[PDB]
Structures are given as C-alpha cells and as structure tokens.
Amino acid sequence: EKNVSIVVAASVLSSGIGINGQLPWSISEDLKFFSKITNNKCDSNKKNALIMGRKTWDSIGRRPLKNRIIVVISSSLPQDEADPNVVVFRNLEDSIENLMNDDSIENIFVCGGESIYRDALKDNFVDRIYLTRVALEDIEFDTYFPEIPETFLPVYMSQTFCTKNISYDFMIFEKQELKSIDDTVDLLGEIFGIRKMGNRHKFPKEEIYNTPSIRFGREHYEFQYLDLLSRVLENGAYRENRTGISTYSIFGQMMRFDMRESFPLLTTKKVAIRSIFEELIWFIKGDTNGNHLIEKKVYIWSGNGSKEYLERIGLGHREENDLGPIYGFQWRHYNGEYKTMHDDYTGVGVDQLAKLIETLKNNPKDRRHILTAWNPSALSQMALPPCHVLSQYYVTNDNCLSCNLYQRSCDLGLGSPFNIASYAILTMMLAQVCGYEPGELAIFIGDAHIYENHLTQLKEQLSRTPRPFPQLKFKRKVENIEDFKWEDIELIGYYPYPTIKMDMAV
Amino acid sequence: EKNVSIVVAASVLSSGIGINGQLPWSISEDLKFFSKITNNKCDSNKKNALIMGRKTWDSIGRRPLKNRIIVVISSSLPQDEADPNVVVFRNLEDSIENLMNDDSIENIFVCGGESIYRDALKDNFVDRIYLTRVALEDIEFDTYFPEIPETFLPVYMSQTFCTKNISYDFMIFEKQELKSIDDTVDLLGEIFGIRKMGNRHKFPKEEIYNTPSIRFGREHYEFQYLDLLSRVLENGAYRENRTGISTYSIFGQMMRFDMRESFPLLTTKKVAIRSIFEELIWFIKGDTNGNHLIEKKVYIWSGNGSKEYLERIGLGHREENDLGPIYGFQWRHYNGEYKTMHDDYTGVGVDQLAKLIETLKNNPKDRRHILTAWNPSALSQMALPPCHVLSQYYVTNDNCLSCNLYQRSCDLGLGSPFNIASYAILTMMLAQVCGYEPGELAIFIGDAHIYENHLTQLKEQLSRTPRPFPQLKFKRKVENIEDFKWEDIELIGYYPYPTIKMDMAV
Ligand SMILES: NC(=O)C1=CN([C@@H]2O[C@H](COP(=O)(O)OP(=O)(O)OC[C@H]3O[C@@H](n4cnc5c(N)ncnc54)[C@H](OP(=O)(O)O)[C@@H]3O)[C@@H](O)[C@H]2O)C=CC1
Ligand SMILES: NC(=O)C1=CN([C@@H]2O[C@H](COP(=O)(O)OP(=O)(O)OC[C@H]3O[C@@H](n4cnc5c(N)ncnc54)[C@H](OP(=O)(O)O)[C@@H]3O)[C@@H](O)[C@H]2O)C=CC1
Ligand SMILES: CN(Cc1cnc2nc(N)nc(N)c2n1)c1ccc(C(=O)N[C@@H](CCC(=O)O)C(=O)O)cc1
Ligand SMILES: CN(Cc1cnc2nc(N)nc(N)c2n1)c1ccc(C(=O)N[C@@H](CCC(=O)O)C(=O)O)cc1
Ligand SMILES: Nc1nc2[nH]cc(Cc3ccc(C(=O)Nc4cc(C(=O)O)ccc4C(=O)O)cc3)c2c(=O)[nH]1
Ligand SMILES: Nc1nc2[nH]cc(Cc3ccc(C(=O)Nc4cc(C(=O)O)ccc4C(=O)O)cc3)c2c(=O)[nH]1
Ligand SMILES: O=c1[nH]c(=O)n([C@H]2C[C@H](O)[C@@H](COP(=O)(O)O)O2)cc1F
C-alpha cells in the first residue's frame, strides 16, 4: 500500500491538456517540475513508476526517463522485456500490482492521457493530484483533463509564474477521508475577553474563508486580498462614517503582491482595468479636471465631482468637476497655490514625480524615494482627502523596483482592487522610465472597511476559487512617463470570474 | 502511562513562588488559569489528580477542589479516607501509582511547593510545565521554583497581561525526547531561483531565530521585533548608503504591539526610556533646538547636530545644533517659513497636533486622524529627513486609541526600539488628553536595515529569551498635552537584559 499521484498540466478553464498528440504549450519549467516531482523518493534503492497511455508514450519519443520506470498501458504494444526501464500492461487495474508485489517501487505516478486519467479517477486509485493550471483558453484542444471529483480537496495553490508571457499555477489536491498549545491559548482567551489581543483578531470562520481546504498552502497572492476580506468580515466593528452607508471596519492591515512573474489584478471578479489606467495617467499628467476623465468614459470621479456634492461639502464656488488640488496636483505641484483647473501651473509647486524618477535612476540605494499626497495646507480645498496617502519606492540589488503604499482608508469592495492594480501599473511605468524590472508591491492599510451594501456581493466573491494572475506588458518604451497611452498596454491571459456590481457610497 | 504537568506561578528573575506560607501576589486571572488548566480533561468519567505538599495543602485552607482529586504528600498527615476528594501519600514515588493502576485519573498535575517541584523534576516524572511568569522582583521571597532543566524546551509564550499594574506571562515547556506541500514548495523553489517570491523571503535559519523551540507559540509581541531582526539577517541585501557604514536591508515589513495590557518596551536589551520620552516631548513642544535635548543629558541628536556634519551636508551657515524644520516643527508649524531655532514660530504653520486632538475627541469615527512629517518644500533645510514619516490614529467602538506608523527607514539596532516606545508613549498621551484607553500600535517599515557594525551585538540580543513587557502609568492628568514631565511617568516591572552598546552611524 503505497502512494499514487496524478501529475497533470491542464488549461485553467476548459481543462485541456493536449492537441494533435502534443502539448498546447511550451513551458520548460513545467517539464522541470514534472521531472522533479516524479523523481521524488525517500529510498535510494527504489525507483518511481510513471503510468501513461500509449499515445503519451509516443509523445515522449518512446524513450525511457532517467531513474524512473515507465509503465505503458496498451492493448497492442508487445510486452517487450529487452528494456528494463519500460514495461507494458494490458489494462490499468493489472498495472496496479506494484502495491502487492514489486517492493522496489516506492511511489506511483499516473501521468497518461485523458483515457488514463479518467479511468484512474473512476477506479478510485488516486490519492493525490499535482495540477498545473495554464492560462491559455483561446486555442484548440482535443484531449481534456476530467473534472476533479468532489472527493478531492485543494490543499495548496502556488503563486502565479510567467513563461513566454504565459501565466501558470501549481496546485495539490488530496483525497479527504500539538494540541496543548491550542488548548492553552483557548483557555487564556476564555479568561481575558478582549484583553488578549488574539480575540480582537480572531481567525475567520470557515463559512467566510475563501477555499477553506487550502490551510497551509495559501501561496497565491490573491489570498492577500481575500483573507483580508475574511478578516474584516470576522472582526469588523460596525461603524458609521461620513456617508449614510455604515461599514464594518478594522485597523492596521497589509497585503503583499508579486510583480516579477505576474500582475496583481484580481481574478475572482472582472476588474475595469481601462478606468484604472486612465485615472493613473490622469494623476501622472498633473490634471485635476474631472471632465477630462468623463470625456474618456471614466466616471469614477463623478460621484465626488457633482455640483450637489461640491456645494454640500462647501465648495459651491468651484466649477462642475473641478476637484481641486488632489492626487496628481500634489505629485507635480506640491504646495502650489491652487486657483482653478484651467490655470497653467507649469513651474509652480514641487514636482515630486520628476524628482522621484531622477532619484530612482541617479541614486538607487537611497532610502528617500517618497511620493506624498497628504498636504495639510491644501486639505480644505480638496474635494476628497487623499486615500492612498504615502508611497515609497525601493531598488533592489538586482535592479528591481518594489513599492510600498500606505492608504489611510480602504474600501475593500471597490477601492482596494483599483488601488492594487493602479499602483502596480505605476510601479511598472516608473521601472520602465528608470530602466528597472518590476519588483514587489506592499500595501499598508489603516482603516480597512467594507460597506454594508456590499456584504452580499463580497461574500459571493469569497465563493470563487482564485485563478492565476494575468500578465501586463507595454507595447513601446516611452521617453517621458507622461507619454503612456491606453493602446500601449497588453493584458495577457486574464480569465476572471464574472463581474460583480457594487454601488459606490458618495 | 498518562501525562504529568507542573503548574507553577513564579517571578520572572528569582523564580520566587511564595512568602510566609502565602503567595507574593494576588492575580485573580492566574487562579482562573490554574482552575481551567487543572480541570482540562477529555473524559467526563475521569478526574484529574493535583499533587501538592503539606504546606501548600495548608495554603488552600485544607479544603478540596471541585472536580479534582487532591493528593497531599506528607509524612505526618493521617491517611484519612473520609474525604474522597483528598488522599495522603507518604512519598512522591508512591503517589505516582495513577500511571499503573487507578484508570479513573486522566492527567496528573504537580502543584506543590519547592520541595515537591524539585524532586518531581529530579526524579524525572514531569512531562510538561505550565509556568506563569510574574514581573515582581523587589519583594521578599522564601520559596523558589527550581531552575528548569535543559531537558525541557519552551514551546509557547503568551502575550503580556496586566493585573493591578503587575505584568505577567504564560509559557509552556515540554520535555524533548502534510510533507507533500513542503516538498512541492521546496521543488518549486529549486526551479525558480528568486522568481518565486518565497525565496526572496526565506524563513530564518535556526541559528539566527530567537528561541527557536517556540515555533507555533510566538504570541509575545516582542517576537514581532526579534523575528524581523532574524528576517533581516536572513534576507538582508548588502547595500551602501549615505554613511560609510553599509547595511543589510530588506523592504516592506510590519510589527504589531499591544498597549491595552502591557507597554512595548523591549526586554532583551535595557532601553534608555528617559531619552525616548525627552525626545518625544521635545517633538510635542514643537522644538528644533538640539541643545535643549543636550542640556537634559540626551545625546541622541548630537551626531546629526555637529558643526562638521552640518558643513558636510551643506548647512555650514546653520548654528551648532540647529537641526532645522524636522519632527515637531512639521507637527506644530507645517509649511512654516523656518529661519533659525531661536525665532518664535507660534502662529505660523499648520498645527497638525492640535487639529489631531480636536478631531480625535470631536469626531472619533473619522478616518483622517493623520499626522505627517514629510514636507518636500522643507526637506532641504532639515539636518535629517523624517524617518517615522506618517502616523494615523483610530478610535475603536470601545473607546480605545490605536496607532499606525509608517517609517521610511528603520535602523533595527538603535532606531527601531526607540520608535516603538516613542509612538507607544505618544499614543498613551493622546489617549489621556482625549479621554481614551491605549489600543494597539502597528508600525509599517519600508527600508528595514541592520548596520554592519551591529551584527555582533544584535546576534547577542537574539540569544536572550524575552521577558514580559512592563507597564507605563501616568501620575497626573494634564490640561494640555505639552505639560507632561519625566517625573509624571511610572515604569512598573521592567526587568530587561543588560544594555547592548551600539554605535550610531552619522
Ligand atoms: N498536459 C499533460 O499533463 C499531459 C498531456 N498529454 C497529452 O494528451 C494527449 C494524449 O493523450 P490521450 O489522447 O488521452 O491518449 P493516451 O495517452 O491516454 O493513450 C491512449 C492509449 O492507451 C491505451 N489505453 C487507453 N485506455 C486503455 C484501456 N482502458 N485499456 C487498455 N488500453 C488502454 C490505448 O492504447 P492501444 O490503442 O495501443 O491499445 C490507447 O490508444 C497528447 O497530446 C499528450 O501530449 C499526455 C500526458 C500528459
Ligand atoms: N506560586 C505557586 O505556584 C505556588 C506557591 N506555593 C507557595 O510555596 C510555599 C510553600 O511551599 P514549600 O515551602 O516548599 O512547602 P511544601 O508545599 O512543598 O510542603 C512541604 C511538605 O510536604 C511534605 N514533603 C515534602 N517532601 C517530602 C518527602 N520527600 N517525603 C515526605 N514528605 C514530604 C512535607 O510534609 P510533612 O512535614 O508533613 O511531612 C513537607 O513539610 C507557600 O508559600 C505556598 O503558598 C505553593 C504552591 C504553588
Ligand atoms: C509529453 N509528455 C507528457 C507530459 C508533459 N507535460 C506534463 N506536465 C505536467 N505538469 N504533468 C504531466 N503528467 C505532463 N506530462 C512529456 C514530455 C517530456 C517529458 C520530459 O522530457 N521530462 C524530463 C524533463 C527535463 C527538463 O526539461 O528539465 C524529465 O527529466 O522527466 C515528460 C513528459
Ligand atoms: C495556594 N495555592 C497554590 C497555587 C496558587 N497559585 C498558582 N498559580 C499557578 N499559575 N500555578 C500554581 N500551581 C498555583 N498554585 C492555591 C490557592 C488557591 C487555589 C484556588 O482557589 N483555585 C480555584 C480557583 C477559583 C478562581 O478564583 O476562579 C480553583 O477552582 O481551582 C488553588 C491553589
Ligand atoms: N467611497 C469612495 N469614494 C471614492 N472616490 C474615488 C474612488 C475610487 C473608485 C474606484 C472604483 C470605482 C468603481 O465604481 N469601480 C468599478 C468596480 C467594478 C466591480 O467591482 O466589478 C466594476 C466596474 C467599476 C468601474 O467604475 O468601471 C469608483 C471609484 C472611491 C471609492 O472607491 N470609494
Ligand atoms: N543613522 C541614524 N541617524 C540617527 N539620527 C537620529 C537618530 C535617532 C537615535 C536613536 C537612538 C540613538 C542611541 O544612541 N540610542 C541608545 C541606544 C541604546 C541601546 O539600545 O543599547 C542605549 C542608549 C542609547 C542612548 O543614546 O541613550 C541615537 C539616535 C538616528 C538613528 O537611529 N540612526
Ligand atoms: O483610491 C481610493 N481608495 C479608496 O478606498 N477610497 C475610498 C475609501 C473611503 O470609502 C472613501 C473616503 O472616505 P474617507 O475620506 O472618510 O476616508 O474613499 C477612495 C479612493 F480614492
């Protein structure tokens, strides 16, 4: 009685694995993963058995794999005894004799075609599943991986990796069938009610924990957002705010995202990337005219740019969508005497973005690459105080650009995905203009809150198992950071779950 | 063969447990912990045995404990059979008969005096140790807990709790005698070198992990600092900076600290708390004169206030210790035209601190309680740009004041403990002025680095097992936040390891 694992690489949606007798992709790292996982063994005097169909045996050139015994399931291939590393069996059930006799086999790997996977799961011989999800779906398939039965549960999901602009994941599925520390902590929590800090940050209940079966393998960095969602649902205090829509809020959280091998755009919900880019390039250009965003069919600043909202916050003198000195005005004209959105501020104010770029490419090991938007003097003139307040940038020894962001208030339903994608795109732009590669993105959140009219929606978003991140590439290298256009961005391999409508609280 | 656990409450240093036949403290929560841990049982048809000496049996009033069988070790007490909840044994070895016969006993708890603990450990009958460390040491003891033998290792250390201004801990010691997920992650790390984000944040090696035996029980929040120290030692990239002393640096980290039941002042090193307080009140008063700190025998700002350092950074015109518009000038006079440290700036600039207090006590549920020190216009005039750049404050539904701090650059050897204690004291001051209780302190670090001249020292600090946090109390309620004086602070139960000299990099 030894272990049996199905090793497979399938597409993310349709679960296709092959086309015309070959793989529908060329990912060398996946072959390396196959080689390393099939050579995994605890005994040096034992080999691992790789069961495969005849057509798969043809796909590998009918040659043996080193340090492994290949078992071909075929009703026509002659049971050749010349090659000791390859043996042929007439059916799959008879091939499962390594459990009974043949003690020189330690682990068994089912890695054949659809005709092998299907009746290896049907006969219930499989204990584990090493699945490699690949983000290709607009191509042609003819061989698919069967839907994983409900008897299996996912226990691990790696981060998203990139190869030839193709995104891919790694997942493990298992066949589901020291307590003293836990008991002492539970007793100490029963004693001190909310005096033990652990009770103020309770672990989220399973009913609001996205993919609860993945406990110790939450490597995919979209979990940095979903687990924050769950923590707010679990420990969020019901509080009122400036809007009539109350929220559930907690304080002091963080999220990490990788940008070397992927792009942190959420897959559990289709995110409007064009509006994000237009807002970001609007910031970079130094503009505060909301009509310029509305003309480009982007209405995220319409709620805070209506005449009624401006007269209500005491800015009735201001023009329709003249938002005042906000994001992008403090970036390019910090401490500049603001008049209207039509004046020419070229020259006035401290151009933080230009100095940031100059410092990033002239003195990388510096610790002062800081872009601030919090200006106490101009706060009263703002239509909305800065939410993403502070940002710091960092150059690694291998010429990568990482970014930290401190955000005073985060609306996890609408503001958070936009902030993640926006600062990722900004880091990528800064890295290209300065000549670096994108690094990591850390977002530090003060007041992380969920509006109460989003509870039905966000819960739905927590019911969707995450898919690998897409890739974001630039079609041309620009000379100045302001020269970016929407046509320059290529979004590759983004297959998210359907969009989830949520109303903005004005 | 069942489990045996020594339950004891001892002082942190001398390990005293009693005085003149009674306890040297009255901590009700510890008695509740005793009651809950000795009644912990998996079988309802079984009782737990509590072994104690005769003098301890006298200390509990010679009355039985509910749902438990008390075993008194005494050579004089008559073996009375009237009370079924109390039994007398002549020696400790004969009392260890519940292992052989008497299957109605599930767990055994050694809870006697020094004379029982010593030869319960000497005879090696003890499997576990539930130790309650109490931070009282300037009192009189007459009964001590023996030094825990090397066969035991700590596996858990709770957070610091407070009762009657007394700090205390909870620790567990044990007698030392799914792998697929780990193997898959190791293989994925072998494939992608530093492309897998996990490899850029490797888990610290045991040789640089403070108290490595405590794996799953690092609850004490001084570990939030020691684990960051270890992570910098593990993943720190060797980088140069403005000073000749190079560092090992990483980017994007955080630390959490509780302030409801303790005070985050490091115990692994004696920290000069008075200098921290004097710097903080110097900030609050709006001062930029380094001579005011030097006159109070505080020399932390002498390196950045020397004539040579000012002439080197291009401020040779400036006076001796005139540091320029820095912390506390941006707090009280933001965007204020700075001249020298002798002028009267009362009135000019935006008083961020006053508005902060006003917003904290007039509009608590607000999300804009923000104090910034990063001013791009005044950066050139500063002797040293702000390290603790931004701070946000938050009022919970139970009227507690929590604080987030973003620090762009952190010197984990000298700057970090000072920053932790300083912002803790500042949060407590704001809480008293606004009428709240202290909450939590979250510190977010951008460039967390360790100077190479501190490597010998900090490693030493990582060899010291943490002791419970102290308490910090105020002797009087002040009318204005600037009225605090050093004589108003009482530091209770601070018993740190000896101080570790480390040179500041100018
Ligand atoms: N992405 C991935 O992880 C993998 C993808 N693939 C791809 O899949 C494609 C090929 O797979 P597939 O089309 O399913 O073909 P198979 O690899 O499953 O091989 C099928 C052959 O195996 C024999 N066989 C199958 N079932 C039985 C049975 N119940 N009893 C006896 N013999 C049996 C038959 O051989 P015979 O006719 O001689 O009797 C049959 O022709 C290729 O593109 C390949 O590259 C393959 C492996 C892994
Ligand atoms: N902080 C804490 O967790 C605890 C503190 N304490 C404190 O400690 C103090 C008391 O402890 P302590 O001074 O050590 O006294 P003990 O509680 O250990 O009791 C000692 C008695 O136990 C009997 N005894 C001990 N060893 C033997 C032996 N080898 N053979 C036969 N009989 C033995 C003797 O009784 P006899 O003379 O009758 O033969 C002896 O006088 C008190 O202040 C108490 O409150 C007590 C428990 C817990
Ligand atoms: C056609 N085929 C089937 C195949 C391909 N990709 C897969 N990918 C996955 N994730 N799982 C599978 N079962 C799988 N099977 C192949 C093709 C090549 C090799 C192969 O040459 N493996 C080398 C790997 C060498 C390398 O590139 O470093 C080895 O050492 O095993 C294996 C199976
Ligand atoms: C003198 N003595 C010995 C004593 C006291 N404190 C300790 N504290 C600790 N952490 N560990 C011990 N072994 C210990 N032993 C005592 C004194 C009172 C009770 C007691 O009354 N316990 C009640 C507690 C009831 C309560 O106040 O909630 C119980 O239900 O067990 C026990 C032991
Ligand atoms: N309170 C409050 N004030 C705010 N002021 C400015 C913002 C920034 C901001 C971000 C996003 C939106 C939005 O509506 N985003 C979308 C979400 C989805 C989705 O989730 O499926 C689909 C489409 C869109 C879209 O607009 O294309 C609107 C504003 C903001 C805020 O976030 N909160
Ligand atoms: N690079 C660089 N520039 C800096 N400019 C200003 C600072 C702030 C600052 C904090 C602390 C000290 C110090 O020396 N602190 C002590 C530490 C210990 C100890 O923990 O052993 C014991 C005593 C003292 C003490 O002075 O009483 C000196 C400056 C600073 C910095 O931190 N780094
Ligand atoms: O990028 C943004 N992210 C974000 O989360 N908000 C939301 C947070 C909050 O719901 C609202 C501001 O409310 P307040 O000003 O009171 O913090 O804006 C706004 C942005 F522009």
Ligand SMILES: O=c1[nH]c(=O)n([C@H]2C[C@H](O)[C@@H](COP(=O)(O)O)O2)cc1F
């Ligand atoms: O409160 C402080 N905290 C702190 O960590 N530093 C350290 C961080 C760094 O070692 C140095 C700042 O120099 P630079 O900004 O050039 O990195 O001072 C200084 C303070 F005043």
